[PDB]
């Protein structure tokens with residue numbers, strides 16, 4: 149899919165991301181145009197060799213099973229292709245918990261710099277919800 153700004157965003161409040169886990173819904177959206185630029189089809193491997201998966205850009209080394217990753221902990225325990233599909237009904241569960249392991253958004257690197265100290269609340273604006 150190719151999501152536009154509003155139409156790729158209202159879904160968090162649909163998946164329980166609004167005001168969720170101490171992170172208000174909006175802190176979350178700005179990274180989205182910093183992670184896949186509203187595309188769940190954007191993916192790469194890395195200089196670490198782990199491959200990434202979805203708009204989410206998740207690495208096959210610590211989180212899931214693409215199988216080319218040995219020693220991949222894969223705590224999620226679900227096929228990586230389960231995210232990349234434009235339909236996002238289930239894709240958020242693992243992305244939900246990743247902040248509960250105690251680092252929060254420290255999992256997410258861009259958000260620490262491209263949305264931190266920046267007004268993210270400005271990003272989630274303009275959409276009725």
Ligand SMILES: CC(=O)N[C@@H]1[C@@H](O)[C@H](O[C@@H]2O[C@H](CO)[C@@H](O[C@@H]3O[C@H](CO)[C@@H](O[C@@H]4O[C@H](CO)[C@@H](O[C@@H]5O[C@H](CO)[C@@H](O)[C@H](O)[C@H]5NC(C)=O)[C@H](O)[C@H]4NC(C)=O)[C@H](O)[C@H]3NC(C)=O)[C@H](O)[C@H]2NC(C)=O)[C@@H](CO)O[C@H]1O
Pocket residue numbers: 182183184192193194196198199200205206207210211246248249250251252254255256257258
């Ligand atoms: C193109 C694009 O989309 N943007 C790019 C992006 O592609 C670039 O690639 C990055 O790829 C990596 C893998 O290929 C993506 O995944 C990162 O990997 C990070 C590696 O440092 C990872 O950091 C670790 O996260 C751990 C969570 O599993 C944290 O664990 C803590 O471990 C302690 C010691 O390790 C332990 O004793 C604690 O119990 C434990 N606590 C928790 C809360 O787990 C830990 O915070 C951290 N390690 C350190 C340094 O302490 C990230 O968590 C992981 N992200 C996710 C969400 O999986 C990465 O997502 C990709 N980048 C981006 C931006 O997302 C990237 C290259 O920098 O550039 C982007 O622009």
